[PDB]
């Protein structure tokens, strides 16, 4: 029993982190096979970041300008290419610690673990969600760029995120491992404002199921609702609309608890309308939206 915000074990990703230095910029790279992935803005001065022309900046860089250090051993760079907003540095040595991996582009609402790194060295690991406005609420200081977000399926690491920038509002923007930003963000130091940070309704319902499963039940009520009635309330509270696809995904938690999804919706509806009245659910005074239904099933069944 007990329910915790839980990251994947980070070992498989620790073994992939390297330091990339270009000129006087140092940040993190991801070493998989004989390729090192890193944010293209490694080639920028802070001055460049105001209005960078990356193709133009890159012309002035050779393989030997990309200094790549794994532990305290330098990797030989034998090639470099730009793909979207990442550089791929071909090194002469395959990472001997390369795990089985995929690159996946996640949807908003999906959760992942971040291994915060500085100078290619892991500092800590935390669980994130891709927000519906395509930001993440991370913990990133200067030097953390190139830190990656990932899920693990048994022995396969799916890389979904690379850290690129902080918005003036202190939220975070990055790319998948093909270098395409989540949302409309650009690797340029400009006016970039996040859209509405809506609550991931399906995740709140998963976490209410996790609560019931762990003995926190005070918020179960005598009511039910409909997807349409519920969604009117969700709209009013800047909650994402709930779809039949969401209901379907909550099916197993429904089955396990014997609480119909629409009943739990009615419970969430009253919580939105009435607030928590100073009570807590799984040690939180607000409704948690960074557990997926898949995360709840995983933690409540003890998958490895």
Ligand X SMILES: *CC(=O)N1CCN(S(=O)(=O)c2ccc(C)cc2)CC1
Positions marked catalytic? 41, 145
Q: Tell me how far apart the alpha carbons of residues 209 and 203 are, in angstroms, rounded to a whole number.
A: 10
What x/- string results for residues 70 through 109 when contact with ligand X is judged by CB under 6 A? ----------------------------------------
Spatial CB neighbours of 217, under 8 Å, sequence gap ≥ 6: 211
Enter the DSSP assignment of 41.
G
């290619």: which residue's tokens? 120
CB of 180 to ligand X, least distance (A): 18
Q: Tell me how far apart the alpha carbons of residues 65 and 44 are, in angstroms, rounded to a whole number.
A: 13
Stretch that binds a copy of itself, among 104-112, 131-139, 183-191, 222-230 (CB under 8 A): 131-139
Backbone angles phi, psi at 4, to 5 degrees: -130, 150
Q: Tell me how far apart the alpha carbons of residues 174 and 243 are, in angstroms, rounded to a whole number.
A: 27
Q: Does 145 bind ligand X (CB under 6 A)?
A: yes
Number of residues located near ligand X, criterion CB under 6 A: 7
Q: Tell me how far apart the alpha carbons of residues 98 and 45 are, in angstroms, rounded to a whole number.
A: 31
Enter the DSSP assignment of 76.
P
CB of 39 to ligand X, least distance (A): 7
42 and 27 Cβ atoms separated by less than 8 Å: yes
Q: Which residues, numbered 45-74, are part of the site for a copy of itself (CB under 8 A)?
A: none
Among 74, 139, 142, 169, binds ligand X (CB under 6 A): 142
What x/- string results for residues 165 through 194 when contact with a copy of itself is judged by CB under 8 A? -x---xxx----------------------
Among 98, 192, 214, 221, binds a copy of itself (CB under 8 A): 214
CB of 139 to ligand X, least distance (A): 13
| Chain residues that interact with ligand X, rule: CB under 6 A | 25, 27, 46, 142-145
């Amino acid at each position: 029993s007990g329910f915790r915000k839980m990251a994947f074990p980070s070992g498989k990703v620790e073994g992939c982190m390297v330091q990339v230095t270009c000129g006087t910029t140092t940040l993190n790279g991801l070493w998989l096979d004989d390729v090192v992935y890193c944010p293209r803005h490694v080639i920028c001065t802070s001055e460049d970041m105001l209005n960078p022309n990356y193709e133009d900046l890159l012309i002035r860089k050779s393989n030997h300008n990309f200094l790549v250090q794994a532990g305290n051993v330098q990797l030989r760079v034998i090639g470099h290419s730009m793909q979207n907003c990442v550089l791929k540095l071909k090194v002469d040595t395959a990472n001997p610690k390369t795990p089985k991996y995929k690159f996946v582009r996640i949807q908003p609402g999906q959760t992942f673990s971040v291994l915060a790194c500085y100078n290619g060295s892991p500092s800590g690991v935390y669980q994130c969600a891709m927000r519906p406005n395509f930001t993440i609420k991370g913990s990133f200081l200067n030097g953390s760029c190139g830190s990656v977000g990932f899920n693990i399926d048994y022995d396969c690491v799916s890389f979904c995120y690379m850290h690129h920038m902080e918005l003036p509002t202190g939220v975070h923007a990055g790319t998948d491992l093909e270098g395409n930003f989540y949302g409309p963000f650009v690797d340029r130091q400009t006016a970039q404002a996040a859209g509405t940070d809506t609550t991931i309704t399906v995740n709140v319902l998963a976490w209410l199921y996790a609560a019931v499963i762990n003995g926190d039940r005070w918020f179960l009520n005598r009511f039910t609702t409909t997807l349409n009635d519920f969604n009117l309330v969700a709209m009013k509270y800047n909650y994402e609309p709930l779809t039949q696809d969401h209901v379907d995904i909550l099916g197993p938690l429904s089955a396990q608890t014997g609480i119909a999804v629409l009943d739990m919706c009615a419970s969430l509806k009253e919580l939105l309308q009435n607030g928590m009245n100073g009570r807590t659910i799984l040690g939180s005074a607000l409704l948690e939206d960074e557990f997926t239904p898949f995360d709840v099933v995983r933690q409540c069944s003890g998958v490895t």
